[PDB]
Each structure stands twice: as C-alpha cells, then as structure tokens.
Structure 1
Amino acid sequence: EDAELLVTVRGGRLRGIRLKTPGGPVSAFLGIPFAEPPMGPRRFLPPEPKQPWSGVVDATTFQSVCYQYVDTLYPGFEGTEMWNPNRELSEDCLYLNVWTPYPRPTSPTPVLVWIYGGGFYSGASSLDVYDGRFLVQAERTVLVSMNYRVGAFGFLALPGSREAPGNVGLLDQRLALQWVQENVAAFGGDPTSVTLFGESAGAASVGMHLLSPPSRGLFHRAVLQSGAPNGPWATVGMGEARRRATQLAHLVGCPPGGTGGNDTELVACLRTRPAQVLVNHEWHVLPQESVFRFSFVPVVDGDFLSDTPEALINAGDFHGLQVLVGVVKDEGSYFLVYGAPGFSKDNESLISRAEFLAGVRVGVPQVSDLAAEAVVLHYTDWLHPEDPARLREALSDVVGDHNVVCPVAQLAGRLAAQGARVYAYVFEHRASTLSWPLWMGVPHGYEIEFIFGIPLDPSRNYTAEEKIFAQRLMRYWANFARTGDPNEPRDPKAPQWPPYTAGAQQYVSLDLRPLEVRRGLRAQACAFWNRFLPKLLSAT
C-alpha cells in the first residue's frame, strides 16, 4: 500500500493507481465522479454536483464513455478508430481524471485541464492519445481531464424551455472546473494557476469559457488547438436548434401521433427513448448534405453566451489573459474523405475539376452560388486550373481555412489587439507512425500525440528525433502553463518565440527543426473569409 495513492476530496476518499514512465512513476486518479449521473428525468438537464459518498471509491480505471456515434467509415483502420470509444457507452459518464507526479508535489503546482474534441458529438477522456502520464512526469505538473455530454444528450436544445435548455455539455465542463477549484489542492495542484487546453471542439469549448463570465473565474490561461468558438460549425441559432431537436423527436416517434406538442411533452417523450435510439438518428436531422456540420452544438440562447461568439470576441476586454493558439499544416485533409467526391484514403485522391467545384459546396455549405464562385476564384491556380494534385490541396485548404485556420486567426488577432498576450504556432511535423495516406500531410488532430508525450511510450515505434521533439513541445506547453510564456524563463540559447500581435502576426513553426518565426496565419486566404465573404452575403 502506497500512502500517495490515497486522497480525500470534499466528496469522499479515492484510491488511485501508479502508472509507469521510462523516467519514473506517476500517480493517476482515473474515474472520479464529479456529478450525479444525468439519467432518467435528469436527461438533457444541467449537471448536479456529485453528492458525498461513504467508503473508498475506486479510481484506478477510466469510467464509461458518454453515448456517442461510433465512426464506421474505415473499420479496423487505426487512423479513425483511435478516436472511437475505448470504454463501454453509458449515460453514467460524468467522471474526471487527475494525474499528479511522484512524489506528490509539496508546493502548489500549476494545473493543465484537457478538454477533448470531436465536433460536440464524440470524444472521451480515456483515449490512448490523451494519456497524461508522460506530460506530468516530464514537467511535474498536474493534469486534469473530464468527460462531458456530447451529441443530443449534451446539446439538444429547446431554447427557452427548462426541460432542455441546451449547452448542458458545456456546464459539465464548468462543473469539472468548479471541482478543480475545490479539490485539485488535495493532489498538489495550484487552483490559482489553471490552464485550460483543448483541441478542435475542445478548443472551441475553451473559447466559449473565455466568453462566459461564470466560467472565467475558474481558470487563468487558455490554449486553443485547431479550433475556436467563432467557427461556422461550433454554434447554432435558437430557431435552428429548435428545428433540429423537433426533428430528432419526430424520427424516434415523438410526439406520439397525435398528441403534441409543447416543449414539455416533447422532452418527456424523448426521456423515455433508449439512448442508442437517439444516437441512431443523430446525423439525420441537419441538411444531410455537407461535411463539417454537426447536429447538436452549443446554442446561442442568451444564457451561457449573452450573444454570438463573434460579438463577444469583438466587444471584449482581454487584459491580463495569456493565450496560446495554433493549427496544423493541413487542417482539412482528413475531413475530405467524409463526403467530398473523388476522395479516398486508399488512392491518391487526384480529383478532377468537376469534383473540386462540387467539393466546395460540401466543404462550404449553406452559401450562395455566387459565393461559391468567389471561393473557386480565390483557390484556383489559373496557370494550372485542371491539375488534380493542385485541386486536391486547394479543396483541403478551402475546408481547412473556412473551418479552422481563419476562425482561429480572427480570434487570435482580436485577442492580442484587446489586451491578451497571444502566442501562435503551426504544427508542421508528420508523425513517422501516421496511418493516414501521405497526401494528407499533417492532418487535423495529429499534434495531440506529441503534446502528450506519446512518443515516449517504449512500445510505440517512434524515432529518436520525435522523442526529443515531443519533449520540446511538452516544455512549451508546461512553461505556458507555469509562466504564460512558452519560452524558458532563462535559456537564451533556444530560439525565441515572439508574441502574436494583430499587426506583426508572428508565429513559429513546430517541427524537428528549431523554431522559425513567420508572419501571417494564411493572411491572404483568411482576408477572403473574414473580410470579403460577409460583405457579399449581405447583398444576396
């Protein structure tokens, strides 16, 4: 029996587990309940705090994954199945995990809180690439990661009603942040040095917590990897969220024809359906004809968000806030095999021009035909307008710029010019173990394994360069967690990472080569999306 694997929190006592690392052990507390299981009549409702428990809750294993769609596009394929649930599904899923070094930190230590992505319809804290044992061992920090309700169970919204207010999946993350405020000290973690970091929808969640006052008091720094709240995929209007919710009810037989009708009989009917039935009809309510659109996302109800994320970013004071932000080199390549014609991970996806013009309508949905022409103009090399290899990478940029890179640069510039110290990066190393095809370059999501030190796992066939490279990135993230500056507070030998400003727009390239400063997060392409495209669609 180790005295360090025993911890008492406000709810009760826990028994953790000792994880091994090629550089020393780590104490892990996997599966801590932080809310009452949102089951039965509590479905679609905001979370309630987990009531205290007698005895010693076992905290040696990941708990269940929240009910979610399982990707079946490429069965057996590692590149897709690494994001699928690796524990069984359940609505009883509101559990968080806490890693802490060995020996336990004696003085208060900075805390990193991870928020998984997955388009607000999937994801789990238990995925092998979110293993925090390597980041906690090498940098002596405290890492926390929670599970939040995805899909309809987390974001079905009948706005105005109290049976389904929406954004309850965001409140789940908030409750885990409130839990960290009250209990991370028991693990050696400093509740006054909390750094949120998430990827994709997780990064969009981090941004929505920057713009929600009740969440701002629970953390002090932010890291948004390949995502932002102002993206065209991360929010939905009240009327549209109502239309999608009523559609889901109809697809599962609600209301029982004919009874109606009001929001209180609809949610009551939805609460009687098995969870898998609700998931079986999730991709069945939206326009049905576009990659990158997710059915149940955060709604702008006026509650969690007083206004749209774009408005709150513009009219917001960000002094005293430090933000690390960045993207990958090829954000859109992995999304093109999910509907874009001519694309297939098992060939070269050398699309024709007809497929390119059709792929733009799928990558950029709900736009006028005139607006589609402007995208084709901006993204065509008119010296080689029919080269398949160039058309493939253009559509990869069309989708990458519209969904990730330009919503991120817009946010980053607006933050720096309004008081926030901002640092920017672009991940430009393709893992030597990557299972996706070569033409996808560095796809969306494949920087996470390096931020979490996964190359240090001796069972994985990573190179010596990637091992040293992962240690560099872990120091960048941890230094930003400790000081708010990814540069070491003393080392002048390592190249300097200059802050990102709305004018200079400086960022660094993260790869095996030393740091290199560059200007412009695709400045030309993003001027089309952020500046010109709204002016057109105003004049339909």
Structure 2
Amino acid sequence: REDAELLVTVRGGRLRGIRLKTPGGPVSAFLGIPFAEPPMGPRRFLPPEPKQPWSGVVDATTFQSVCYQYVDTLYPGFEGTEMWNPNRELSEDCLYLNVWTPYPRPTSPTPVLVWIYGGGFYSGASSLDVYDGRFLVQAERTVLVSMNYRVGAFGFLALPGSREAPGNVGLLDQRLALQWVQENVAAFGGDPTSVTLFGESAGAASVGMHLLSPPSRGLFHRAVLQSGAPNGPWATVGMGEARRRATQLAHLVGCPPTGGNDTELVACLRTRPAQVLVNHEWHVLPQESVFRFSFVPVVDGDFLSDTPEALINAGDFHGLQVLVGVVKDEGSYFLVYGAPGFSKDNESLISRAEFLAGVRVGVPQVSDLAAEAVVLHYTDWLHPEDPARLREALSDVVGDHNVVCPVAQLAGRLAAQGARVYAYVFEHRASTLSWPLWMGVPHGYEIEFIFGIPLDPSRNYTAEEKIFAQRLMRYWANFARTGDPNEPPQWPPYTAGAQQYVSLDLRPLEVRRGLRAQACAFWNRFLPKLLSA
C-alpha cells in the first residue's frame, strides 16, 4: 500500500515524499513543497502570498522549477560553470522548498539547518546537485530545509515607495519559508526552537539581512555565512539607484510606451515575457564591472531600516552564535568574467596597464583618488610590473573588497557586541576541480565538502577528501546543535583583538590570526573616510 514515514501533514494539507538511498543508509526527502502562491501574472514583483490549503495529498517527490534567471554562457559545456546553471526548467511558478529528514523520522525534536543558495541575487536554485541535503542528514541526523526564492528583476526590481514593486520580494520569499519552517518543521521531526540559517555568497548576504531585520530575527537561532556578507558593496543598493535601474530596464523593453506612474509602468512590465526581462537585465548597470549585479536587495527602510553597516554597528548581538569564513582565493573566479587579460584557458599573466584597468573594473564607481589608493596599496613597489604578482594582486583586490573584508568587519563587530563568533579559511583545492591552477581555491568550492558530496560513490573524490567532508559536516552540525563546532585540536572563537580563525584543509586544524588585517584596515577603516571627502 503506502509507507507511513513518507506521509506528513503540514498546516496547508497532506504531503507524500520519497525514501532516498544514501551510501550510509536511507533518508526521507520531501522535494518541491509549495510554500507560497505562484508569483505569476498580476503577482509578479509582488510580495509572496502564503500557500492556500489544499485537499488530497501533494506529491513532494522531486525538485520543482528553477526561478527564472539568466543562464551562464561563458564556457559552454564546461563543468566549472555548468554546475551552477539551472538543472530544472525555468518558471515563475518556483516558490517551493525541500525538507530532508532521517528515516525513520526522528522521535524527539532534531535541530534544523536551513540553506539559502547564492548566485549574486540573479541566479541559483535549491535543486543543484551540489546542494543535495541527503548526505548531511544521513551523516549527522539533522533536518535540512532549503527553499527557492525569486532572483533578478523578479525578485529584486524595486520602484521604492510603490506597492506594485516594493522591492526585496526575493528576501520575503525566504522569510515566508522561514515562517513555514517554524509552523511545520516539527511535523518532520525538527526542532523549531533550534534553527540554523546557512548560505553562501548572496545566500550568506541574505542570512545577514535576516539577522538585521527584526521580523526575520525571531525565526532562527544561529547563522553561518560562507563567502558573503550583507555589508558587501554588491549586496544592496540605494532607493534612487534601484529606481533608476528599474526605470531603465522598463525603458529597454518598450514599457511605458518614462517613469510616469508607478502602477502604470509596472503593469506594462507584467505583460512582458520573463525571458525578455532576463535578456535586458545586465544592460541597466551603470558601468563595466565584475562583481556587480543589477537587482539586489534595496535599502528602503522596511526590510532594512538602515544600511547593513549601520545596523551591524548599532546592533546588540548577545545570545547569537555565528560561523563565518572564506575560501582562500575569493577573487580569482570573477576575473575571467571581464577583467582584461584574464581567461581560464591560460595563465592570465597581466601587464601593469591591464592591472590598472582591472582595478577600475573590480572597484567600480569610485573616484580616481580612491582607485589610486587601491593601486598604491596593492602594488609591490620593488616589483611593480611583475605579471604573476599583478595577477595575484588584482585577485586580492576584488576578493578583499567584495568578500573577505566585508565579512571580517561583520565578524569583528558581532564579536565586540555580544555574539560568539567562529571563523575559518577554507584552503583545500578539490582533486576534481576543473578550473585552472592559478585560481587556487576559487569562490564557492567549499560547498560540496560541507554538503558531503564526496560521499557520492559515483564521484572520484579521494578517500581523504571523504574523511575531510565528514569532518566539516560534523563542524557544521555541531555548530547547529550547540553553537560551538568543537566536540564535547580546538577551534577558538573569533574576537576583535586576537582575530583567531582556523584553516580547513586535509591537515588538522591550525589557528592563525587576522583575516587579512592589513588589507581590511584599508577597506573597512580608511577608504570610507576618503569617499566622504
């Protein structure tokens, strides 16, 4: 007849899932659970509406559609970029979440990990093979939840102040899913009083925005931010710039036939095919750049009552445990997306002039004075034109500016203001990595080890990489359970003075000091004062 472990009643109605095989045993998976009404037609750009109850049983047995998004075409067929591309059909009917739970379902409440994917707020989906939650659940006996949220114009196009495109609706998709977890995760055996958010890149920035937004802050208890932070120069935009990009996108697709009236302009935008909007999304950016995305969260006083930097500084974080970290070469992957002289298919040994040109691309919309401060800082004046040093230097520029230093400042302010902070640098380059060697450990390539993907026997990770994956899954699950990744070589907390972090590689833990303290002093302490004068 039917398996009772694969049947669950949530508030909206009844669900049926699947028993998934893992190397270490079975898990229960509930894939493609609807948590909102489909944001289509007149509901495009609008905040999500809770899912209306249903009769009968909803088959939650496979991943649902990927939210409409740009699809990368830089290296067609190349595995390094195709692993991030959608592996389901694109659709605006895309607001579904997934729950993995042990089989049989836990008897006592189990801590919950909620995953938020990255993708620069223009791409991503919960269905990518690298986000498979079955290994974490099997190896560490937790409930894992992940959700889809709208991206690009559909998720973050803002006409601030209006009600037909209030902006930040992608973030409220995530908030609605977090509300779903609170009311429904106990039906799967999860503990709604022990919920850990974790995300990577734009997903990590999203996790931060949930810490800084009171309505979300009551929906979870711990946070993990990998290679991203809400105070990053890319993660938010101002109301005026949001309105300019939205208006310009509208103008490029023929609507209005030209700011005019907000409702009349959004109404014309809703008549355009989703693909049309996606095809003009990149044209709205003010300048040539890497690491800049058209539609991102807007600082509009609602979701974010101030900028994330202001709330990070004015924040009281007692009772909060946070885990933050970076990969070793955060900036290298992005240089092959527009920096002059860079390619994955050669060594990308650039000239001095290409370095100075790459600085303006990696640090866009700053004065010439600011740009020369960057060049001064990143130049080795005993070797000013060494191509190999120049390649590394520009990698450090975009990496420090966009990831490492925003995260270091978040870590320091939270530790100094009541939070327990743990920090890592991920330094293992996977044996299966398809990117060239000069890129080191690129952005986003720690995720597969945290989700335990090397345990998939149909993948050729070495045996030591599988023990490594098992090590980090324990760290993360220990953190989710207790707020401390150490087991009951130690991992010390991060503090504003000592600034201690650990390296995560095949070797045992190693404690170091300072997350590029010299470089981040420039980005977090000095250069803000330069832009204010």
Q: Distance in 2 between matches of 1:353 and 1:102?
A: 58
In structure 1, distance between residues paired with 2:259 and 2:147: 37
- For residues 265-285 of structure 1, give each alpha carbon's deviation from its aligned partner in whole angstroms, at most 9, with x where no partner exists: 110110111111111100010
Residue in 1 aligned with 2:276?
Answer: 277
Secondary structure (helix, strand or coil) at the match of 2:359 reads: helix
The 5-angstrom pairing of residues 3-152 of structure 1 reads: 3-152=4-153
Shift of 1:61: 0.3
Number of equivalenced pairs: 531
2:493 corresponding residue in structure 1: 499
Task: Give CA-to-partner distance per residue, 1:110-142, whole Å, 9 cap, x none.
Answer: 000000000000000000000000000000000
Whole-Å Cα distance in 2 between the matches of residues 322 and 534 of structure 1?
28
Cα deviations by residue, 1:438-459 (Å, 9 ceiling, x for unpaired): 0000000000000000000000
What is the TM-score when the length of structure 2 is the normalising length?
Answer: 0.99
Task: Measure the CA separation in 1 of the matches of 2:259 and 2:364.
Answer: 32
Secondary structure at the aligned position of 1:338 is classed as: coil
Q: For residues 208 and 249 of structure 2, what CA distance do their matches in structure 1 show?
A: 28
Secondary structure, in 3 states, of the residue corresponding to 2:391? helix
Question: Is the 8 Å Cα contact of residues 117 and 199 (structure 2) preserved in structure 1?
Answer: yes
Tell me, yes or no, if structure 1 residue 390 matches structure 2 residue 371.
no
Give me the whole-angstrom Cα distance separating, in 2, the residues matched to 1:64 and 1:42. Answer: 17
How far apart in 2 are the matches of 1:261 and 1:354? 44
Q: Unaligned stretches of 5+ in structure 2? A: none
Q: Report the TM-score when normalising by structure 1.
A: 0.98
CA contact (8 A) 2:287 2:364 kept: no
CA displacement at 1:311 relative to structure 2: 0.3
Indicate conservation of the 8 Å contact 2:179/2:219, yes or no. Answer: yes
SS at match of 2:381: coil
SS at match of 2:254: coil
Unaligned runs of 5+ in 1: 489-494
Kindly tell me: are residues 260 and 413 of structure 1, through their superposed partners in 2, closer, same or farther at Cα, counting changes over 3 Å? Answer: closer
Q: Give, in whole Å, the separation in 2 of the partners of 1:377 and 1:163.
A: 46
What secondary structure sits across from 1:112 in the alignment? strand
Any idea what the Cα deviations from partners look like across 1:218-274, whole Å, max 9, x if unmatched?
Answer: 000000000000000000000000000000100111101xx8611111101101111
Q: Could you report, residue by residue, the CA deviation over 1:169-215 in whole angstroms, capped at 9, with x for unpaired residues?
A: 00000000000001000100000000000000000000000000000
Offset from partner CA, 1:119-169 (integer Å, 9 cap, x none):
000000000000000000000000000000000100000000111000000
CA contact (8 A) 2:31 2:60 kept: yes
- 8 Å contact from structure 2 (residues 123, 152) kept in 1: yes
Q: CA deviation at 1:55?
A: 1.0
Q: Indicate if the aligned counterparts of 2:35 and 2:177 stay in contact, CA closer than 8 A.
A: yes
Cα shift readout 1:379-434 (whole Å, capped 9, x = no counterpart):
11122211111110100000000000000000000000000000000000000000
Residue 222 of structure 1: aligned partner = 223
Q: Structure 2: how far apart are the matches of 1:536 and 1:311?
A: 18
Note the alpha carbon deviations across 1:274-332, whole angstroms, 9 max, x for none. Answer: 11111110001011411111000000111001100000000010000000000010000
Going from structure 1 to structure 2, the CA distance change for 1:347 and 1:7 (only over 3 Å counts) comes to same
Map 1:159-178 onto structure 2 (within 5 A). 159-178=160-179
Tell me the distance in 2 between the aligned counterparts of 1:138 and 1:204.
27
Alpha-carbon distance in structure 2 between the residues aligned to 1:127 and 1:260: 38
**C-alpha distance in structure 1 between counterparts of 2:146 and 2:514, whole Å:** 32
Determine the C-alpha separation between the residues in 1 that align with 2:95 and 2:486. Answer: 36
User: What displacement does 1:74 show?
Assistant: 0.5
Instruction: List aligned pairs for 1:186-201, cutoff 5 A.
Output: 186-201=187-202
SS of aligned partner of 1:431:
coil
Name the SS for the 1:407 alignment partner.
helix
Counterpart CA distance in 2 for 1:308 and 1:381 is 34
1:346-388: CA deviations, max 9, x gaps?
Answer: 0000111111111000000011111111111111112221111
State the alpha-carbon separation in 2 of the partners of residues 261 and 527 from structure 1.
Answer: 44
Q: Report the Cα distance in structure 2 between the residues aligned to 1:267 and 1:333, rounded to whole angstroms.
A: 38
Task: State the Cα distance separating 1:497 from its structure 2 match.
Answer: 0.3
C-alpha separation in 2, matches of 1:538 and 1:318 = 28
Answering whether residue 173 of structure 2 is matched by residue 179 of structure 1, we say no
How much does 1:537 deviate?
1.7
Alpha carbons 2:136, 2:473 under 8 Å: kept = yes
Q: How far apart in 2 are the matches of 1:220 and 1:524?
A: 32
Partners of 2:247 and 2:259 within 8 A in 1: no
Q: Secondary structure at the match of 2:90?
A: coil
The ranges of structure 1 where at least 4 consecutive aligned residues each deviate by more than 4 angstroms after the TM superposition are none
Q: Give CA-to-partner distance per residue, 1:44-82, whole Å, 9 cap, x none.
A: 000000001111111110000000000000000000010
CA contact (8 A) 2:425 2:503 kept: yes
Match of residue 520 from structure 1? 514
Are the counterparts in 1 of residues 69 and 151 from structure 2 also a CA contact under 8 Å?
yes
Partners of 1:350 and 1:226 in 2: CA distance: 25
Task: Give, in whole Å, the separation in 2 of the partners of 1:311 and 1:374.
Answer: 24
User: Share of identical aligned residues, percent?
Assistant: 100
Whole-Å Cα distance in 2 between the matches of residues 537 and 37 of structure 1? 43
Conserved in 1, the CA contact under 8 Å of 2:421 and 2:494? yes
2:69–2:152 CA contact under 8 A, matched in 1: yes
Q: Residues of 2 paired with 1:517 and 1:504: CA distance?
A: 11
Between the aligned partners of 1:474 and 1:292, the Cα distance in structure 2 is 29
* Correspondences of 1:401-416 after superposition (within 5 Å): 401-416=400-415
Larger mean Cα displacement after TM superposition, 380-389 or 99-108:
380-389
In structure 2, the CA distance between the partners of 1:408 and 1:83, relative to structure 1 (3 Å rule), is: same
Please state whether the residue corresponding to 2:237 is helix, strand or coil.
coil
